[model samples]
Target: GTYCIELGERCPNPREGDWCCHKCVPEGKRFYCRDQ
Candidate 1:
């Protein structure tokens, strides 16, 4: 594995247009400028 993020066993409330971790992609939204 090159780079990975572990959320342990919890996740944050995802917003419609918010960019989150790689394991948390918006339902149909795109990643803009939240995560690297």
Candidate 2:
């Protein structure tokens, strides 16, 4: 991942996981937010 966005339950933590992006569109592990 190019960058770590604040997301998930914490909503302010760095989580690294496999993700996919296309033309600025977010998909994949983006939903795997730190919540889990």
Candidate 3:
């Protein structure tokens, strides 16, 4: 499974067992994004 977000945008806050927004491209790794 994979997730993604827009550039300069933040993904919805996700808790455990939730479909969290993660960076899954280019580098191809699951990484959480912090809203700035």
Highest-TM-score candidate: 1
Candidate 3 ranges beyond 4 A from true positions: 1-3, 16-36
lDDT of 3: 0.36
How many residue-pair clashes does candidate 1 contain?
Answer: 0
Error of 3 at 6 (Å): 3.6
lDDT of 2 by residue, 1-36 (tens): 336433432221123433322122233543433323
Which lDDT tens digits does candidate 1 get at residues 1-36?
Answer: 224334332234446422235554433343222332
Q: What are the clashing pairs of model 3?
A: none
Looking at candidate 3, the ten consecutive residues that score lowest on lDDT are: 22-31
* Candidates' C-alpha lDDT: 0.36, 0.32, 0.36
Kindly report which residue stretches of model 2 are placed more than 4 angstroms away from their true locations once superposed.
1-3, 9-32
Give the TM-score of each candidate: 0.21, 0.16, 0.20
Per-candidate clash tally: 0, 0, 0
Q: lDDT by residue for model 3 over 1-36, one digit each (tens)?
A: 235454434334343322334432222243344332
Q: Model 1 lDDT vs. the true structure?
A: 0.36
Better of 1 and 2 by lDDT: 1
